[PDB]
Amino acid sequence: VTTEILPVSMTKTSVDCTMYICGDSTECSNLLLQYGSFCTQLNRALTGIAVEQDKNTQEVFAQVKQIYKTPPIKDFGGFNFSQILPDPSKPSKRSFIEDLLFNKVTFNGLTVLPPLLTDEMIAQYTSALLAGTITSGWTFGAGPALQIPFAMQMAYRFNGIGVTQNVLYENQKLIANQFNSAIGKIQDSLSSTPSALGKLQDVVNQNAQALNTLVKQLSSNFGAISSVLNDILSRLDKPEAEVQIDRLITGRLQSLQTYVTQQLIRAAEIRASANLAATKMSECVLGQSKRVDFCGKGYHLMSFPQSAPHGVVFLHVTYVPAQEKNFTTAPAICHDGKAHFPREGVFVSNGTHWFVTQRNFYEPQIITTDNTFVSGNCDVVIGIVNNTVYDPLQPELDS
Amino acid sequence: LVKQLSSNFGAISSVLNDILSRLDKPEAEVQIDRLITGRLQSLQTYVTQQLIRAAEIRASANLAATKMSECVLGQSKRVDFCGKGYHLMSFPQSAPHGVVFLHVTYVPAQEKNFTTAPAICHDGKAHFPREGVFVSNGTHWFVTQRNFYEPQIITTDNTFVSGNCDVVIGIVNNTVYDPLQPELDS
Amino acid sequence: STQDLFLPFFSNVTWFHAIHDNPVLPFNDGVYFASTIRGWIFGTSLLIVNNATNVVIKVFEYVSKNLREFVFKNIDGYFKIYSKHTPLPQGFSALEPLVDLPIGINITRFQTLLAAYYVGYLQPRTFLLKYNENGTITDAVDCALDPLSETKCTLKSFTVEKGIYQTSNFRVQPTESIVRFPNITNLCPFGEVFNATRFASVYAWNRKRISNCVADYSVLYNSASFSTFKCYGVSPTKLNDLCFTNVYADSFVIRGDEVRQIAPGQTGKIADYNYKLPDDFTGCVIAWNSNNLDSKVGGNYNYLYRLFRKSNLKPFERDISTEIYQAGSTPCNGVEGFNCYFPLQSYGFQPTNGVGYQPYRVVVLSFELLHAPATVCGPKKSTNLVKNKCVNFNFNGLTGTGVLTESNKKFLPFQQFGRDIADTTDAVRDPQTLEILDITPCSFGGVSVITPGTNTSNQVAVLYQNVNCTEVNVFQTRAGCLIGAEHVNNSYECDIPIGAGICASYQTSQSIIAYTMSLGAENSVAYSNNSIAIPTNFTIS
Ligand SMILES: *[C@@H]1O[C@H](CO)[C@@H](O[C@@H]2O[C@H](CO)[C@@H](O)[C@H](O)[C@H]2NC(C)=O)[C@H](O)[C@H]1NC(C)=O
Ligand SMILES: *[C@@H]1O[C@H](CO)[C@@H](O)[C@H](O)[C@H]1NC(C)=O
Ligand SMILES: *[C@@H]1O[C@H](CO)[C@@H](O)[C@H](O)[C@H]1NC(C)=O
Ligand SMILES: *[C@@H]1O[C@H](CO)[C@@H](O)[C@H](O)[C@H]1NC(C)=O
Ligand SMILES: *[C@@H]1O[C@H](CO)[C@@H](O)[C@H](O)[C@H]1NC(C)=O
Ligand SMILES: *[C@@H]1O[C@H](CO)[C@@H](O)[C@H](O)[C@H]1NC(C)=O
Ligand SMILES: *[C@@H]1O[C@H](CO)[C@@H](O)[C@H](O)[C@H]1NC(C)=O
Ligand SMILES: *[C@@H]1O[C@H](CO)[C@@H](O)[C@H](O)[C@H]1NC(C)=O
Ligand SMILES: *[C@@H]1O[C@H](CO)[C@@H](O)[C@H](O)[C@H]1NC(C)=O
Ligand SMILES: *[C@@H]1O[C@H](CO)[C@@H](O)[C@H](O)[C@H]1NC(C)=O
């Protein structure tokens, strides 16, 4: 179980250009009128960014038609999702890991606009996706939700990675124990390491730094006798106060344009990240992905979403092979001058004689006419070996 | 951008000919420099915003190209990349400054509840389905494909054996019809 | 979109009757007029008459179902008239101008000679004009009549699509003005430094330190005794409303035409050898001829200057050195002669000299705008102190606007100002008493207008962003204060996003409703450990 943290949105800001530049002075406002519609462009740009943030959140999290609920009794074949399912005790119906994540990300015309979706709404969406994956699998993302036992779902997914479903049903307890242990280890690795959420904190810090620079830039003279419009106006007459105020306007307008340009660029970056998070919610959560390294490291089984401040955290559950063994193998087998190839798997030998096994989990089986298919004679394949192929009808053919 | 030419930017007029037809070189130069400063700032702003919008449009176009390659020239297993549902095929249609994909998908419908088992015990042997699931309508057990109810008799052809029926959790007892013995008239 | 004096839409125009005598009318910045009355007296002068053949106008003379609509106004004396023959009903009918009188009468009255008529006044009201293809105003929008018209002006359209638009910025206006100067009474002794008997000579210019007083610089630039009275970094006009820490009157007497050397960045004799002002000088220079007493017959050589100096000077340093000046390499050691000069010489001031030669008294008033307590203030009256209200305060000469409150900030006895990240005064100390009060910018925010499409309706809701409803049918969000929306307890798909989970829609007697948006239809999958749902059919989507 591995985490992937993706930023989805950033803070929605608005700046009254005419109030940042000209606080409440009407001399300065009339003097800024003759720069045209720069203020309108700036506000339009920032408003577009702000709308885009809510759009990104919708695209990532609003991927369920209905709000699915987990049953009261959590009998999931030994699998325990208590740490990722919502806690009804808390006022905000958040999971333990979501609470853990939310504790680790910490005028002059500037306002911060609230997001359209509250953290509670996002937590509801995440709980719905979780419940859908737990109760219905990948069906709820492709149509109506169709209930299926969780062990049978995980067998489906095991087949999806090329491992027979007997392998899960015969190791169900071990697989559940491994999963629950890995979730606990996620809990711990997150609660301890401080910079696990560096990406979201970085988004936050970038925004704060930009705003602080913007604000400090009002203490600059830009060539004028003072950085305070009132002092200029309380000391000078109209014709020369106008000169000083024009200097200040030029400077503050340049500063604000720099801010807005940088924010547009960062918003494009964040939009890319949110589109990636949306694709991962569709392909990893609402389905089983064959794409390598797209849903974690290993053969992807299933991902679980968790809300985070301005972002999403995917818990990718993958199958990692282990405890390798060396065998000698062959592409085909000669039997009665016929070349046999494995329908599904490989021919291996422990040294003495030959078996056929599936490629991702050693499960040796007798080489029969059911595990193999014939194509040609045994004089054209490079590496073909001699061995008997057991037809399971002749010894049965007592009649 | 065009309206930004009606702005003075501090000059006495926004019209160069007026400044040139009214003032001599030394001071007309001052006023024209104000106008140049402002109009150049406006043009730089326009170009920067256009670069940013062009980046957005390039991203959208690359997405559309990926969708033409994967949804139209092939059949995609990527969920929600080519419409909602199990994707069958997409068709393109040109549009002003863009493309329109008609995604044809298969959406399951008319669900039915069944009771299921992961495996079946027969002769001390655990049978699992090669392709599909075991279901029961209440009386007999059948094996069907997972996305369309099409029940079939559980045979030794619809299933494979792996182990005994004491390790699978939820295994049920039911007969597995070998299609050789009643056929074995000889 | 123009910004002119218009008749605001849907306003109260008086209706007068003449027959049971024309009544008395005022004339503000402008006037409207209509009728079913030929003539219009003015004054505080102008007169118009229709002899049924040509209009006659006098002051100057000029000659040239009748809803005869008229508009009159005066701007810098120019008197504009507009009118139209409309055959107060509905519709639009723009008024072409007919005449302008470019003379200029101060008008504060209005009359009429000769029925029933109408009168409406004009205010500066930004309008959005709709010129049709044929070039005629066929429609208009008053940008301040209502929120919908403000939205139309902000979008520059007559149709508004459904949505939420921030149209302007709300901010509380000040209730009253405040002035807090120190309780000082003694006048600054300006007559002394100005009417002194003998100003020290330019090489030993004498610097009086005016402090702890009330200076009235009004009388300085009122008196006409000064040939030159010119200030840098400040205007004399506004000197009576500034409070300075202290003033330095550097007085001396100099040559007649070497006066313009007393200014920042100046180079020459007195600048670089005797007295220069810093390039950041903030203060006034006063120079006036002293031929009346200073210069006498025979040569008044009792006023000195320093001719030779080995190098230049700092701003504001004095040299009382009388030591000889050495030009060559041979030491002099106190004896004149070969290359041994005396650096001090004497002005030759006789009334027989030229006009650009007489002695000029020069006093340079240098001001320091430090943050120490202000001692030299202006002749401005202090007022009372008002807290918990947006006011136009003036503490020790620094203006501002905001709400004053009791602060718990621990100013140390030497501090007089708090300061913000943006060099904004966050807190201040009263000069009259000694207490620390916090300054806070009185509430502001954006004003968004929730409107369905103008096709659907014309009523709107208004969102005051990030403000309480107490400083502005009414419903408080975490996005601000909504006005004009009904808060239902239901939950629907979001139509118009307000924020913080709140959406707004036009529906039911249609109205604007504000609700908490729903994420979707609840559902509970019938999950059990031995149940599976399998499809029996499909749709091709
Ligand atoms: C599968 O669904 C289709 C509808 O998508 C069903 O078709 C309809 O059948 C009814 C009566 O049988 C007709 O009145 C409709 O005109 C049919 N519609 C179409 C589009 O063919 C079909 O019967 C369903 N099959 C099953 C087994 O339920
Ligand atoms: C699930 O795990 C939690 C620890 O996170 C534990 O308290 C709880 O008992 C577990 N539930 C089951 C059924 O094992
Ligand atoms: C396979 O044999 C090689 C022999 O060089 C050895 O290095 C390797 O560790 C063996 N692998 C396993 C999984 O035992
Ligand atoms: C190989 O496997 C067979 C059957 O599993 C066993 O009989 C034989 O002893 C094994 N030999 C080696 C070398 O592992
Ligand atoms: C494998 O390599 C050995 C020697 O390295 C050679 O004798 C043998 O024929 C090769 N077999 C195949 C299938 O290439
Ligand atoms: C396999 O058997 C055939 C005949 O049965 C023989 O010709 C061939 O050499 C054998 N191959 C090996 C590797 O022994
Ligand atoms: C399956 O049974 C449950 C019982 O809780 C029921 O709610 C659900 O509608 C059933 N499914 C179908 C497709 O009828
Ligand atoms: C289940 O199906 C079998 C064969 O299709 C039928 O004989 C039996 O009656 C069915 N039982 C129920 C409960 O529908
Ligand atoms: C399913 O749950 C029931 C009780 O709710 C239990 O008796 C049965 O053994 C369970 N079977 C499986 C396969 O979990
Ligand atoms: C299945 O059959 C075996 C013996 O044939 C029996 O021991 C076992 O209890 C049966 N299982 C059930 C669920 O009846």
- Nearest-angstrom CA–CA distance, A81 and A131: 10
Sheet with A2-7, side-by-side order of all strands: A2-7, A311-319, A299-308
- Assess contact for C343 and C309: CB atoms under 8 A: yes
Pairing of strands B125-129, B120-122: antiparallel
Closest CA to A140 of A300, A282, A31, A320: A282
CA atoms within 13 Å, Cβ hemisphere of C505: 14
User: How large is the angle between the packed helices A198-216 and A238-280, nearest 10 degrees?
Assistant: 170
- Cα(C445)–Cα(C439) distance, integer angstroms: 18
Tell me if B149 and C533 make a contact (CB, 8 A cut-off).
no
Name the burial class of residue B177, with classes exposed (0-12), middle (13-18) and buried (19+) by CB atoms within 10 angstroms of its CB.
middle
Tokens 């059911």 correspond to what residue? A370
User: B170 — alpha (psi -120 to 50), left (phi > 0) or beta?
Assistant: left
Query: Taking phi first (over 0 means left), then psi (-120 to 50 degrees means alpha), and beta for anything else, what does residue B80 get?
Result: left
Inter-chain CB proximity B38 and A41 less than 8 Å: no
- State the Cα angle at A185 between A179 and A188, rounded to 5°: 150
Resolution of this structure in Å = 2.8
Provide the residue count of chain A.
399
A347 C-alpha to center of ligand 6: Å?
18
Comparing alpha-carbon positions, the chain C residue that sits nearest to A64 is C520
Experimental method: cryo-EM
Pocket-forming residues, ligand 7, beta carbon under 6 Å: B 111-113; C 526, 533
Q: Which chain A residue has its CA at the smallest distance from B109's CA? A: A144
Distance CA A372, CA A369 (A): 5
Separation CA A212–CA A206 (nearest Å): 10
- Measured between CA atoms, the residue of chain B closest to residue C537 is B109
A222 vs B9: CA distance, rounded Å: 17
For ligand 1, whether the C-beta of C541 sits within 6 Å is no
- Looking at residue C106, its amino acid is N
Q: How far is the CA of A67 from the centre of ligand 2 (A)?
A: 24
Whose atoms come closest to the Cα of A169: which ligand?
A: 9
Record the tokens describing residue C129, joined without a space: 């004009």
Tokens representing A212?
């602080």
- Bridge-based pairing of strands B172-173 and B120-122 is parallel
**Which 3-state string (H, E, C) describes A114-178?**
CCCCCHHHHHHHHHHHHHHHHHHCCCCCCCCCCCCCHHHHHHHHHHHCCCCHHHHHCCHHHHHHH
Kind plus residue range of the DSSP H or E element containing C214: strand C213-214
Closest-CA residue to A145 (of C233, C40, C524, C468): C524
Nearest Cα to C250, choosing from C290, C291, C196, C213?
C196
Residue count of chain B: 186
Residue C403 main-chain phi, psi, to 5 deg: -95, 135
User: Rounded distance, CA B23 to CA C396, Å?
Assistant: 45
Beta-carbon separation of A111 and C445 below 8 A? yes
Pocket test for ligand 10, best of B121, B167, B172 (most atoms within 8 A of CB): B121
Interchain CB distance below 8 Å, A290 and B77: yes
Q: Whose CA is nearest to atom 1 of ligand 5?
A: A383
* Ligand 3 nearest atom to the CA of residue A324, by list position: 13
Residue C492's Cβ-count burial label (10 Å; 0-12, 13-18, 19+) is middle
Whole-number Å distance between alpha carbons of C198 and C303: 10
Residue of C nearest to B135 (CA): C532
Do residues C505 and C488 touch, judged by C-beta distance below 8 A? no
How far does the CA of residue C259 sit from the closest CA of chain B (Å)? 30
Which residues of B have a CB under 8 Å from any CB of A? 3-4, 6-10, 38, 41-42, 45, 48-49, 52, 55-56, 59, 77-81, 84-86, 107-109, 111, 116, 118-119, 126, 128, 133, 146, 162-163, 167-170, 180, 184, 186
- Both tokens of C10, joined, read 């849907």
State which residue of chain C sits closest to B145, comparing Cα positions. C534
Helix (H, G, I), strand (E, B) or coil at C82: strand
Nearest-CA residue for ligand 3 atom 3 is A326
- The verdict on a CB contact (< 8 Å) between A235 and C521 is no
Residues with C-beta less than 6 Å from any ligand 9 atom: A 75; B 169-170; C 529-530
Q: Give the chains touching B; criterion: ≥3 Cβ pairs < 8 Å.
A: A, C
Answer whether B85 sits within 8 Å of C541, measured CB to CB: yes
Q: Tell me, rounded to whole angstroms, the distance of Cα C353 from its chain centroid.
A: 50
Q: How many residues does chain C have?
A: 541
Q: Whose CA is nearest to atom 10 of ligand 2?
A: A80
B101 interaction partners in chain C (CB closer than 8 Å): none
Using DSSP bridges, classify how beta strands C474-476 and C480-483 pair: parallel, antiparallel or unpaired. Answer: antiparallel
Chain B residue numbers with beta carbons less than 8 Å from the beta carbon of C525 are none
SS3 A386: strand
Proportion of chain A in helix, strand, coil states, percent, rounded to 5? 45, 15, 40
Q: What is the secondary structure of C95-163 as a DSSP string?
A: -EEEEEE-S------B-----EEEE-B-EEEEEEEEE-TTS-EEEEEETTSSHHHHHHHHHT-SS--SE
Q: Taking a C-beta distance cutoff of 8 angstroms, is the pair C79, C72 a contact?
A: yes
Report the helix count and the strand count for chain A, using DSSP H and E. 11, 13
> b/e per residue, B121-143, with b = 16+ CB within 10 A?
bbeeebbbbeebbbbbeeeebbb
Structure tokens given for A183: 């979730």
- For the record, the structure tokens of C146 come out as 């209502």
